[PDB]
Design a protein around this motif. Structure first.
Motif, PDB file in Angstrom:
ATOM      1  N   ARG A   1       0.857  -1.161   0.000  1.00  0.00           N
ATOM      2  CA  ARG A   1       0.000   0.000   0.000  1.00  0.00           C
ATOM      3  C   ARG A   1       0.905   1.226   0.000  1.00  0.00           C
ATOM      4  O   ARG A   1       0.632   2.213  -0.666  1.00  0.00           O
ATOM      5  CB  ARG A   1      -0.941   0.008   1.215  1.00  0.00           C
ATOM      6  N   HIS A   2       2.010   1.155   0.724  1.00  0.00           N
ATOM      7  CA  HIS A   2       2.916   2.292   0.788  1.00  0.00           C
ATOM      8  C   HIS A   2       3.365   2.704  -0.597  1.00  0.00           C
ATOM      9  O   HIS A   2       3.253   3.868  -0.963  1.00  0.00           O
ATOM     10  CB  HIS A   2       4.142   1.961   1.636  1.00  0.00           C
ATOM     11  N   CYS A   3       3.868   1.753  -1.369  1.00  0.00           N
ATOM     12  CA  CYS A   3       4.333   2.061  -2.712  1.00  0.00           C
ATOM     13  C   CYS A   3       3.206   2.620  -3.553  1.00  0.00           C
ATOM     14  O   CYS A   3       3.283   3.755  -4.018  1.00  0.00           O
ATOM     15  CB  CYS A   3       4.900   0.815  -3.360  1.00  0.00           C
ATOM     16  N   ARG A   4       2.161   1.822  -3.738  1.00  0.00           N
ATOM     17  CA  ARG A   4       0.995   2.228  -4.515  1.00  0.00           C
ATOM     18  C   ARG A   4       0.608   3.693  -4.332  1.00  0.00           C
ATOM     19  O   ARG A   4       0.209   4.347  -5.299  1.00  0.00           O
ATOM     20  CB  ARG A   4      -0.191   1.342  -4.157  1.00  0.00           C
ATOM     21  N   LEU A   5       0.732   4.202  -3.101  1.00  0.00           N
ATOM     22  CA  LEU A   5       0.384   5.586  -2.788  1.00  0.00           C
ATOM     23  C   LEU A   5       1.407   6.570  -3.307  1.00  0.00           C
ATOM     24  O   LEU A   5       1.045   7.573  -3.917  1.00  0.00           O
ATOM     25  CB  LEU A   5       0.238   5.811  -1.281  1.00  0.00           C
ATOM     26  N   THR A   6       2.683   6.314  -3.048  1.00  0.00           N
ATOM     27  CA  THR A   6       3.712   7.225  -3.531  1.00  0.00           C
ATOM     28  C   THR A   6       3.754   7.117  -5.040  1.00  0.00           C
ATOM     29  O   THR A   6       3.716   8.116  -5.748  1.00  0.00           O
ATOM     30  CB  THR A   6       5.086   6.869  -2.995  1.00  0.00           C
ATOM     31  N   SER A   7       3.818   5.888  -5.529  1.00  0.00           N
ATOM     32  CA  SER A   7       3.856   5.656  -6.957  1.00  0.00           C
ATOM     33  C   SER A   7       2.778   6.466  -7.650  1.00  0.00           C
ATOM     34  O   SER A   7       2.886   6.737  -8.840  1.00  0.00           O
ATOM     35  CB  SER A   7       3.679   4.169  -7.257  1.00  0.00           C
ATOM     36  N   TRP A   8       1.745   6.850  -6.903  1.00  0.00           N
ATOM     37  CA  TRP A   8       0.658   7.668  -7.441  1.00  0.00           C
ATOM     38  C   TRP A   8       1.021   9.152  -7.362  1.00  0.00           C
ATOM     39  O   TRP A   8       0.943   9.875  -8.356  1.00  0.00           O
ATOM     40  CB  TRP A   8      -0.645   7.450  -6.663  1.00  0.00           C
ATOM     41  N   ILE A   9       1.402   9.613  -6.178  1.00  0.00           N
ATOM     42  CA  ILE A   9       1.755  11.012  -6.014  1.00  0.00           C
ATOM     43  C   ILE A   9       2.889  11.404  -6.975  1.00  0.00           C
ATOM     44  O   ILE A   9       2.983  12.558  -7.406  1.00  0.00           O
ATOM     45  CB  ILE A   9       2.184  11.306  -4.566  1.00  0.00           C
ATOM     46  N   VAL A  10       3.748  10.444  -7.313  1.00  0.00           N
ATOM     47  CA  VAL A  10       4.855  10.704  -8.231  1.00  0.00           C
ATOM     48  C   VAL A  10       4.256  11.058  -9.582  1.00  0.00           C
ATOM     49  O   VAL A  10       4.843  11.807 -10.351  1.00  0.00           O
ATOM     50  CB  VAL A  10       5.762   9.460  -8.406  1.00  0.00           C
ATOM     51  N   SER A  11       3.075  10.517  -9.858  1.00  0.00           N
ATOM     52  CA  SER A  11       2.386  10.761 -11.121  1.00  0.00           C
ATOM     53  C   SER A  11       1.515  12.011 -11.107  1.00  0.00           C
ATOM     54  O   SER A  11       0.862  12.324 -12.095  1.00  0.00           O
ATOM     55  CB  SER A  11       1.524   9.554 -11.493  1.00  0.00           C
ATOM     56  N   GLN A  12       1.497  12.722  -9.991  1.00  0.00           N
ATOM     57  CA  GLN A  12       0.694  13.928  -9.902  1.00  0.00           C
ATOM     58  C   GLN A  12       1.601  15.138  -9.851  1.00  0.00           C
ATOM     59  O   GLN A  12       1.310  16.186 -10.425  1.00  0.00           O
ATOM     60  CB  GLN A  12      -0.179  13.887  -8.655  1.00  0.00           C
ATOM     61  N   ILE A  13       2.712  14.992  -9.152  1.00  0.00           N
ATOM     62  CA  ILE A  13       3.662  16.072  -9.048  1.00  0.00           C
ATOM     63  C   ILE A  13       4.576  16.002 -10.272  1.00  0.00           C
ATOM     64  O   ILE A  13       5.474  16.821 -10.441  1.00  0.00           O
ATOM     65  CB  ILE A  13       4.459  15.923  -7.762  1.00  0.00           C
ATOM     66  N   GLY A  14       4.320  15.020 -11.135  1.00  0.00           N
ATOM     67  CA  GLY A  14       5.112  14.837 -12.344  1.00  0.00           C
ATOM     68  C   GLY A  14       5.413  16.120 -13.089  1.00  0.00           C
ATOM     69  O   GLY A  14       6.518  16.635 -12.999  1.00  0.00           O
ATOM     70  N   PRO A  15       4.452  16.664 -13.838  1.00  0.00           N
ATOM     71  CA  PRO A  15       4.786  17.900 -14.536  1.00  0.00           C
ATOM     72  C   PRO A  15       5.252  19.000 -13.572  1.00  0.00           C
ATOM     73  O   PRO A  15       6.209  19.709 -13.861  1.00  0.00           O
ATOM     74  CB  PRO A  15       3.484  18.242 -15.259  1.00  0.00           C
ATOM     75  N   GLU A  16       4.594  19.122 -12.421  1.00  0.00           N
ATOM     76  CA  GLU A  16       4.931  20.149 -11.425  1.00  0.00           C
ATOM     77  C   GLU A  16       6.436  20.308 -11.113  1.00  0.00           C
ATOM     78  O   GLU A  16       6.940  21.425 -10.944  1.00  0.00           O
ATOM     79  CB  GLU A  16       4.173  19.856 -10.119  1.00  0.00           C
ATOM     80  N   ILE A  17       7.151  19.192 -11.033  1.00  0.00           N
ATOM     81  CA  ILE A  17       8.571  19.226 -10.721  1.00  0.00           C
ATOM     82  C   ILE A  17       9.416  18.889 -11.929  1.00  0.00           C
ATOM     83  O   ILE A  17      10.396  19.566 -12.197  1.00  0.00           O
ATOM     84  CB  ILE A  17       8.914  18.252  -9.573  1.00  0.00           C
TER      85      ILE A  17
END
Lengths: 423, 283, 283, 63
Positions: free
Chosen positions: A135-151
């Motif tokens: 569950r830990h990964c699944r969550l970060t692995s997601w946020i990484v896909s949201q802050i993607g363009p942002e950073i």
């Protein structure tokens, strides 16, 4: 020359010039008096306050039934849900990957939809620690896909390679953050960056005991080299050289990615872990993906928070509320009251009434716990819209929902009986 | 010219109407479009409120009027005639309402003289009239029946029904298990004529409510927590600087349609926080 | 495209305006007709509120903005120029207001960083800035000056002024007879950002009032029964199911103009009975 | 030695349980070690029916 009683009766009754009237009718539609009718009865219908296209297709309502087990209650024959395997995941398909919706949903599908080992190993001390992390990964692995363009884009900006690294770390991208550390003749970083992924007290102290000495009379050090050592200290925000300053340019959800990746301040449940990040920071106003976190964060007080949150809740869709309470209730995931559950089930089951969708109304309504109200509603809903629930709404729904045989016949006849003297 | 009350039929097909010209018209709305069918003339004065009975007894419509008489119109294959009439009151008859279909077929009419009649139905063209003399001081305006709540088969019901009047009181009522009705309680808070009273239909929930509007311009929602003891605590919805005429309850989200004030019509919903708000204005 | 705030001048002749395009226009309304005169451009971000000073000091207009700066525009015979500017705050500056003309010429500006500045005027092109750091938690939105109430000649005044913020509190303030302002009190009841705060100008009467509106959708009218009673008891005007943006007081019947909710604007008058009613809806 | 893009893919294909192990891959934990190996031994019984790749990957955990 004879409208004198229309001045005495109008005056004897206190009936002023401005007398208007409005009344709802069984069909759940109001009638306010406008000169727009043969007689003057503008029959406006009541607007659903529900917006999500897939609710109008049978395949959803239909398919989503197969997901349940219906059984008559212990005080009558009226059907009520016994077992339902309903996950937020289910919803994912009928939506488009762009809307905040897919997010709000795909997020819970992570935060709450259940995780599981696929093979059959049985060491509870392990299987419990694996799902704890899947569950830990699944969550970060997601946020990484949201802050993607942002950073990803904020990096095309810096002729300061050391800063670039720290930004690559933010994307939980240790590999490309290391490839760079070495390519710039800043090797010693690549080393720490290595330890970054795990917990070793040696490193922890080597970075922190180091940081303390860094504020003496030793400057000209990059705010970035420190920010990076800080990521090793353990807790980067309550630190001796805190990162709380990032707040000005990084959307809150980026920082969070940090407390979840490097913020392991203790080896405990993820739920309360998220709750830790929140204690130090505020959150976007009117943001659903945000709220969803608080709901996951306050694990025991869910109902207490939900209710508490429902007071500024124009962000959480009535349908979502319902759906949440139920995916949590039927998976054992969280603690929900009978009063709150049904409270929010009338909510939804009513919008569906107002959307002339008696498949959904009746279906949802079976989620009622109060045998009295359940019977009560269903008898009403059906008695009035039988024809609408027969020959073509895919032909079966009523039997599909284990409705009562007597009510079908009973109410049906009642109408044929009615139509009998109108034809 | 100007219509008074107009109530749709059960299955949402026909739609009875009535206005000051003493004419009770019955349109029929198959697919958003209006289409008059009959014009039942029979009142020596404007018709006030109108009410459709439960399709369980063929198709019945009942209209009251300032002509001191109440008419019940039956139907027998396009045949819209009068199967009964009742002129048991000395003054205008402001409102009518049918009792929940379980209590049989009962009509409740309140007149402008201060009385109330209760037409029950017996087999054939016969109607008894257990009447309530001097139920209100100056007169009665609204009559609303309490929801059909269940307690050998076909149980005895606490057949209650409220009704506001010109005396400013909204008196609830109860059928004494012997034969007649005795006013269970009076409800004071309105500083002027109670215009309309509406018994919000319990969505299965035991928290029975009631709403009322009056010449003062206030709408109170009397909510009661009954543990066998009447304790109706009124709460203010809103006060407008003009009279409120009618109040009807939506059917599921307890959405109160407030008809009064500026020729406008407003909608209200009790928010998760206890206070009532306006969801939209209707025009 | 869309204007933010617009306040008429003293004698009701000119009318300053400002919108998101960073432009402060000054029309002039001689006989119902509008006629632009100047377009003062000078903010790196949209302009929020605007305020005219008392004609007692020539003709002054002041506009604040999201550009973290406040501009004061003077006039010297058709000459609309800048006689001063103040960029003493780190974030947006949501509102501005002039102190009653008796306290001299003082401007009160609250910024989005949580501070408040107070430009006093001294003889020539010089302005001191006694500032209030961290007056609100997340930021400040509204600033309103308390009425000019009187206690050698030209008496010392209890120079007070309120101001709501993002922390949900509506803090009143007072100038300590030494030099700085200390918040006399906090006002809690708003469950979200305080959007605007308006100190209703005492019609000679000692019953000083204050009204506020916020994202929750409630408008409270806070009151000090007497003088130095230290007490402010909030009372609810109305809650709408959407945010309220501005609130300004009429000038004589204490008619509250409520700007918020459905793009509509409502008016309220306190009735002889304590309760507040809506007198008319504006469109 | 590119764990990040190797994980981004594991999840994007509905093969999540991998992304998990791939996580432990960078460090030494005997639990995982045995969980992969004790698993592998059982994988050659009668169900020699899984990707040569899923195994190759568990193999990377064996030590």
């Amino acid at each position: 020359d004879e409208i004198d009683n229309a001045k005495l009766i109008m005056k004897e009754r206190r009936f002023t010039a401005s007398y208007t009237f409005a009344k709802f009718s069984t069909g759940s539609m109001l009638l306010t008096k406008d000169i727009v009718g043969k007689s003057g009865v503008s029959i406006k219908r009541l607007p659903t306050e529900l917006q999500r296209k897939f609710l109008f297709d049978d395949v959803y309502l239909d398919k989503e039934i197969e997901k349940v087990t219906i059984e008559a209650r212990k005080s009558n024959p009226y059907p009520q849900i016994s077992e339902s395997s309903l996950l937020f995941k289910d919803a994912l398909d009928y939506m488009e990957k762009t809307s905040s919706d897919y997010n709000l949903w795909k997020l819970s599908s992570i935060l709450f939809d259940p995780v599981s080992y696929p093979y059959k190993t049985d060491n509870d001390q392990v299987k419990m620690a694996l799902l704890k992390k899947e569950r830990h990964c699944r969550l970060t692995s997601w946020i990484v896909s949201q802050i993607g363009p942002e950073i990803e884009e904020k990096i095309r900006n810096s002729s300061n390679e050391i800063e670039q690294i720290f930004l690559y770390l933010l994307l939980n991208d240790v590999v490309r953050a290391s490839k760079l550390a070495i390519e710039s003749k800043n090797g010693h970083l690549s080393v720490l960056i290595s330890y970054l992924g795990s917990n070793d007290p040696r490193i922890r102290d080597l970075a922190e005991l180091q940081l303390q000495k860094w504020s003496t009379g030793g400057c000209s050090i990059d705010k970035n080299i420190s920010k990076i050592y800080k990521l090793l200290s353990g807790s980067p925000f309550e630190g001796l050289f805190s990162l709380k300053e990032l707040e000005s340019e990084f959307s809150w959800l980026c920082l969070l990615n940090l407390t979840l990746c490097y913020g392991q301040i203790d080896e405990y449940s993820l739920e309360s872990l998220v709750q830790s990040h929140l204690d130090k920071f505020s959150l976007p106003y009117d943001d659903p993906i945000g709220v969803i976190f608080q709901l996951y964060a306050a694990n025991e007080n869910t109902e207490k928070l939900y209710k508490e949150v429902r007071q500024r809740t124009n962000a959480l869709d009535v349908q979502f509320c319902w759906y949440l309470i139920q995916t949590l209730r039927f998976n054992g995931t969280r603690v929900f009251s009978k009063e709150t559950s049904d409270e929010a089930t009338f909510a939804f089951a009513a919008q569906l009434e107002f959307a002339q969708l008696h498949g959904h109304s009746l279906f949802v309504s079976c989620f009622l716990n109060d045998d009295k109200a359940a019977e009560d509603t269903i008898k009403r809903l059906v008695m009035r819209e039988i024809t609408l629930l027969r020959a073509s709404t895919n032909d079966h729904i009523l039997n599909r929902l284990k409705i009562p045989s007597q009510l079908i016949f009973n109410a049906q006849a009642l109408k044929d009986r009615y139509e009998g003297n109108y034809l | 010219d100007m219509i008074h009350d107009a109530q749709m039929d059960y299955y949402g097909t026909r739609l009875a109407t009535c206005s000051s010209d003493r004419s009770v018209k019955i349109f029929d709305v198959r697919n958003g479009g209006q289409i008059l069918i009959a014009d039942l003339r029979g009142h020596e004065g404007p018709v006030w409120q109108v009410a459709w009975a439960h399709p369980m007894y063929g198709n019945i419509l009942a209209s009251c009027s300032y002509d001191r008489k109440v008419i019940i119109w039956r139907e027998e294959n396009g045949t819209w005639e009068k199967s009964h009439e009742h002129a048991g009151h000395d003054s205008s008859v402001n409102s009518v309402c049918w009792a929940p279909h379980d209590y049989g077929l009962i009509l409740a009419c309140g007149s402008s003289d201060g009385a109330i009649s209760l037409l029950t139905y017996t087999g054939e063209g016969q109607w008894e009239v257990k009447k309530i003399n001097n139920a209100h001081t100056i007169g009665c305006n609204a009559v609303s029946w309490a929801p059909a709540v269940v307690p050998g088969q076909k149980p005895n019901y606490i057949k209650r029904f409220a009704s506001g009047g010109c005396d400013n009181l909204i008196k609830l009522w109860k059928e004494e298990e012997d034969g007649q009705w005795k006013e269970e309680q009076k409800l004071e808070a309105h500083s002027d004529w109670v215009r309309d009273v509406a018994w919000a239909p319990s969505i299965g929930l035991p928290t029975s409510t009631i709403a009322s509007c009056s010449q003062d311009g206030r709408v109170f929602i009397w909510t009661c927590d009954d543990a066998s003891s009447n304790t109706w605590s009124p709460k203010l919805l809103h006060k407008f600087n003009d009279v409120v005429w009618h109040v009807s309850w939506s059917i599921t989200a307890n959405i109160l349609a407030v008809s009064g004030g500026d020729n406008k019509v407003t909608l209200w919903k009790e928010s998760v926080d206890g206070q009532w708000v306006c969801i939209s204005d209707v025009n």
